[PDB]
C-alpha cells in the first residue's frame, strides 16, 4: 500500500499539507473549507489502509486515488487534468488585513492559519515547487511568531511579509520556466539546461555524475509539474541525501548545506554557490576540434559527445549564462552536421570556436547597454523605457500584461547591474529568460500576438534574442485615444509609490498603443507633465477640483503633441 507507506513516512501534518497543495493547484476555484474536507477524506482513507493494507483501494497508487477524488482514463486522465491549470486565475487580489487581525487569527488556530497560507499561494501559482512552498510556510510562520510579540508588530512583520511575497513570486517564475521547459519542449530540453547549470555549479563533477544528478532532477520536477507532489517531495529528499553522500565527487561548497535539516538542506543545496574550477583543465580544442575522432564520435555517440561538449564548456565558463551555453552547443552541433559530411571535415571545422565570439559579445553588449541606461534613469524610469520599448514591439499584448512584464524586465537593472562587469551576464540573461516565460505563458492562454507566439514557440534558447531583435510593429492599428486613462481622481494621493507608478505606467502603455510612432523624447514629455500634474493636485487644498480641471488641460496638451 503506497498510500499507507507515504502516510507513515511523513506524519499526518506533512502528508496533509502536500495533499492540500495538490488540490489547491488543480481545483483553484473551490473554497478553503472544501479543500480541507477533501484532504481529510484522503487522510481518513489513508488511516484505514494503515489498519488493513488489504482494504478497498489500498493497492492503488496515490496518484490514481487523487484523480479518483478529483472527479467527485490513465495516463490520459492526468494529462487532461493538466490542461486546466490556470496561470492567470480570476481570483481576488490577496489583500492582507490589519496586523492585529492577522495576529489574532495566527494565535487562535496556527495550524489552520498556515493551511490558508498554503491554500492561497498554491491556488494562485498552480506550478509552485511544492517542497519550497512548505519552506515558505515555515518562514511565514516564523515571522508571525516573532512579530506578534514585538513592541512594534507592523514594523517587524510587514517588511518580512513583503520579502516573502517578492521571493515567492521569483520562486514561482523560476519553477514555471522549469515546468514549461518540460511540457513544451520536452524532457530533452530540460536535461540540456540542467547539464549546463550543474556543470557551472559542480565543475569538479564528472560528466556521468552531472548526468546522473540531471536524471534525478528531471524526475523530481516531472513529478512536481505532473502532479504527484508526494513523490516529488520524497525524490528531492533522496537527491539531497545522495548529493551529500557523494559531495566529495561533486562540490566542496556542500559541507555547510549537509548538516542542516531536510527542508533547509534541500534549499541550501539548490542555492549553493558555484564551486571552484579544477586547475588541470585542458582547452576544449584538444578533444573537440583538434582530435581525430570528432566526426566518429558525432556519428557513433551523438548525444553523449554533444552533451559532453556542453558539460565541458559550461564548467569552464560560469560567467556565461545557461542560454548562451546552450547556443554554443547548438552552434557546435550544426557545424559538425555540416562539416562531417564534407570532403576534409577538419579543414572546415578547425575554426568552430571563432563563431562563439559573436554569440558571447551579443548578450554582453546588450547588458552593458541596459546597465548603462539603468544608471542614468533608475528603476522606475528604466521600466518606463522598457515599457515604451516592448509596447512598440508587441502592442497587441494586454495592458496589464505589458505593465507587469515590463516592470519585471526593469528589475534586472536593480538586480544585476550592481554586480561586477563579468558576473552580469548569467544574472541578467537568465532572469530575462524567466520574465519572458511569464509573458509566454500569460499570452498562451489568450494569444493576441503572432510575434509573441513566434518567439515563445520557435525555440527556448533563443527567446531573449528573438524579442530583442523585434522592431516596432507595423501591422498594428493604433488604438483610438480614450481619455478615461489619463483622468485620475484624488484617490491617487493615498496610493503607494508602487501602486501609483503602476497607474502612471498603465497610461504610458495606452498612450503608446494609440501613438505607436511617438518619439522616445516625446513620450517622456507627456510623462514628465504627468508627474508634475499629480504632484501639484495632491498638494492643492481642493484636490478633487483641480484633478478634474487641470486634468482636462493636461489631456489637451498631450493630444496636441
Amino acid at each position, epitope marked *: 500500500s503506497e498510500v499507507a*507507506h507515504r502516510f507513515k513516512d511523513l506524519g499526518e501534518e506533512n502528508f496533509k499539507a502536500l495533499v492540500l497543495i495538490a488540490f489547491a493547484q488543480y481545483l483553484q476555484q473551490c473554497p478553503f473549507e472544501d479543500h480541507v474536507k477533501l484532504v481529510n477524506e484522503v487522510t481518513e482513507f489513508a488511516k484505514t489502509c494503515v489498519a488493513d493494507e488489504s482494504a478497498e483501494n489500498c493497492d492503488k497508487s496515490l496518484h490514481t486515488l487523487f484523480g479518483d477524488k478529483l472527479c467527485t482514463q490513465e495516463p490520459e486522465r492526468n494529462e487532461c487534468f493538466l490542461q486546466h491549470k490556470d496561470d492567470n486565475p480570476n481570483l481576488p487580489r490577496l489583500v492582507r488585513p490589519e496586523v492585529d487581525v492577522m495576529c489574532t487569527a495566527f494565535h487562535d488556530n496556527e495550524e489552520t492559519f498556515l493551511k490558508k497560507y498554503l491554500y492561497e499561494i498554491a491556488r494562485r501559482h498552480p506550478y509552485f515547487y511544492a517542497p519550497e512552498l512548505l519552506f515558505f510556510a515555515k518562514r511565514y510562520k516564523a515571522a508571525f511568531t516573532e512579530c506578534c510579540q514585538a513592541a512594534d508588530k507592523a514594523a517587524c512583520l510587514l517588511p518580512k511579509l513583503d520579502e516573502l511575497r517578492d521571493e515567492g513570486k521569483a520562486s514561482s517564475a523560476k519553477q514555471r520556466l522549469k515546468c514549461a521547459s518540460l511540457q513544451k519542449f520536452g524532457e530533452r530540453a530540460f536535461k540540456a539546461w540542467a547539464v549546463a547549470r550543474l556543470s557551472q555549479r559542480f565543475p569538479k563533477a*564528472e*560528466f*556521468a*555524475e552531472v*548526468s*546522473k544528478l*540531471v*536524471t534525478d532532477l528531471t524526475k523530481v520536477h516531472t513529478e512536481c509539474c505532473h502532479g504527484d507532489l508526494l513523490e516529488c517531495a520524497d525524490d528531492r529528499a*533522496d*537527491l539531497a*541525501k*545522495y548529493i551529500c*553522500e*557523494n559531495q*566529495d*565527487s561533486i562540490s566542496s561548497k556542500l559541507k555547510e548545506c549537509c548538516e542542516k535539516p531536510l527542508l533547509e538542506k534541500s534549499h541550501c543545496i539548490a542555492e549553493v554557490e558555484n564551486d571552484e574550477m*579544477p586547475a588541470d583543465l585542458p582547452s576544449l580544442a584538444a*578533444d573537440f576540434v583538434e582530435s581525430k575522432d570528432v566526426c566518429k*564520435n558525432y556519428a*557513433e*555517440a551523438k548525444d*553523449v*559527445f554533444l552533451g*559532453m561538449f556542453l558539460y565541458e564548456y559550461a564548467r569552464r565558463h560560469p560567467d556565461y549564462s545557461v542560454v548562451l551555453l546552450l547556443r554554443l552547443a547548438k552552434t557546435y552541433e550544426t557545424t559538425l552536421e555540416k562539416c562531417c559530411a564534407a570532403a576534409d571535415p577538419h579543414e572546415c571545422y578547425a575554426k568552430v570556436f571563432d563563431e562563439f565570439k559573436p554569440l558571447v559579445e551579443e548578450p554582453q553588449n546588450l547588458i552593458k547597454q541596459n546597465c548603462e541606461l539603468f544608471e542614468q534613469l533608475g528603476e522606475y524610469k528604466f521600466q518606463n523605457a522598457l515599457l515604451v520599448r516592448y509596447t512598440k514591439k508587441v502592442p497587441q499584448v494586454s495592458t496589464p500584461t505589458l505593465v507587469e512584464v515590463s516592470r519585471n524586465l526593469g528589475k534586472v537593472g536593480s538586480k544585476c547591474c550592481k554586480h561586477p562587469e563579468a558576473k552580469r551576464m548569467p544574472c541578467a540573461e537568465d532572469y530575462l529568460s524567466v520574465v519572458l516565460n511569464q509573458l509566454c505563458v500569460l499570452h498562451e492562454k489568450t494569444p493576441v500576438s503572432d510575434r509573441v507566439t513566434k518567439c515563445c514557440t520557435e525555440s527556448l534558447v533563443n527567446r531573449r534574442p528573438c524579442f530583442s531583435a523585434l522592431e516596432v510593429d507595423e501591422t498594428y492599428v493604433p488604438k483610438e485615444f480614450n481619455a478615461e486613462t489619463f483622468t485620475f481622481h484624488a484617490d491617487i494621493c493615498t496610493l503607494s509609490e508602487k501602486e501609483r507608478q503602476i497607474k502612471k505606467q498603465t497610461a504610458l502603455v495606452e498612450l503608446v498603443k494609440h501613438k505607436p510612432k511617438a518619439t522616445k523624447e516625446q513620450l517622456k514629455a507627456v510623462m514628465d507633465d504627468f508627474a508634475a500634474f499629480v504632484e501639484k493636485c495632491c498638494k492643492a487644498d481642493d484636490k478633487e477640483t483641480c484633478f478634474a480641471e487641470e486634468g482636462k488641460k493636461l489631456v489637451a496638451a498631450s493630444q496636441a503633441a
Partner: antibody, heavy 119, light 109 residues
C-alpha cells in the same frame, strides 16, 4: 559496444598480473569503468572503479594497497594491475561500464578473464 | 560500504509462476539499486536500474520495486529462460559498490 578483455591466467601467491579491457562502440572517454570479480561458484564482488577522466578512483577494502586501476583514454583501454596476489583473489574478473546517465549501474560487461592464484 | 542482504538463497518454482526476490539494504540507499541476471557461464546482464526502471530489452514480467530499505524484484510469467541467478547492487555509497549474495531461480519439477 564491445569490451574485449585480455591478460589473466595463473600466478603464484605474491605474484603479479595485468588485466586489459579494450573498449569500442561508445565514447569510452565519457564513461566510468569498473572491475568486478566472481570466484568460482560464488557471487559478484566489486573490485575497483575509475571515472571518465581518471580523477576519482575507488577500491574495495580487500584489494586496497595491492591493486591499481588505470585507463588510457587515447587507446580506449582499461587496466588493472594486481600485485601481491592472494589465493582469495582467484576469480573471473569482468570490466563493466557504468551507465552514463542512469546512475552507477553496470550496463555492459566484458566476457570475463579467469585469474587463478595457486602454487 | 552498505551491505545488501538477499533472500532467499534458492527459489524453486514452476514455469508460469511468479518469483519474488528480496534485497534488504543495511542503510537507506535511495533508489540507487540495480538488479542483474546471470546464467551459468555468462557475464551478468543488467535488468533493473534505479530500483524500478527496467533496462532496454528487458521483458515486462520483470518489475522492481522499493519500499524503504527493502527492495523486491518480481518476475510474473516465469519462462524457462528466466531461471538464473539474480544479484542486486547499490550505487549510493560514495566509497564502494556493493552487491548482494544472490538468489537462484530453480525450475521445480
Amino acid at each position: 559496444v564491445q569490451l574485449v578483455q585480455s591478460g589473466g591466467g595463473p600466478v603464484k601467491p605474491g605474484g603479479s598480473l595485468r588485466l586489459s579491457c579494450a573498449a569500442s562502440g561508445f565514447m569510452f572517454r565519457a564513461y566510468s569503468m569498473n572491475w568486478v570479480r566472481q570466484a568460482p561458484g560464488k557471487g559478484l564482488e566489486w573490485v575497483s572503479s575509475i571515472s571518465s577522466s581518471g580523477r576519482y578512483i575507488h577500491y574495495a577494502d580487500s584489494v586496497k594497497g595491492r591493486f591499481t586501476i588505470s585507463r588510457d583514454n587515447a587507446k580506449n583501454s582499461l587496466y588493472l594491475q594486481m600485485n601481491s596476489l592472494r589465493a582469495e583473489d582467484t576469480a573471473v574478473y569482468y570490466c563493466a561500464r557504468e551507465t552514463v546517465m542512469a546512475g552507477k549501474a553496470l550496463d555492459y560487461w566484458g566476457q570475463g578473464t579467469l585469474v587463478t592464484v595457486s602454487s | 560500504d552498505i551491505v545488501l542482504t538477499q533472500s532467499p538463497g534458492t527459489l524453486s518454482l514452476s514455469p508460469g509462476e511468479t518469483a519474488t526476490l528480496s534485497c534488504r539494504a543495511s542503510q537507506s540507499v535511495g533508489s540507487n539499486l540495480a538488479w542483474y541476471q546471470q546464467k551459468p557461464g555468462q557475464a551478468p546482464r543488467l535488468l533493473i536500474y534505479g530500483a524500478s526502471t527496467g533496462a532496454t530489452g528487458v521483458p515486462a514480467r520483470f518489475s522492481g520495486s522499493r519500499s524503504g530499505t527493502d527492495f523486491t524484484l518480481t518476475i510474473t510469467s516465469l519462462q524457462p529462460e528466466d531461471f538464473a541467478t539474480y544479484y542486486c547492487q547499490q550505487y549510493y555509497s560514495f566509497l564502494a559498490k556493493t552487491f548482494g549474495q544472490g538468489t537462484q531461480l530453480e525450475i521445480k519439477r
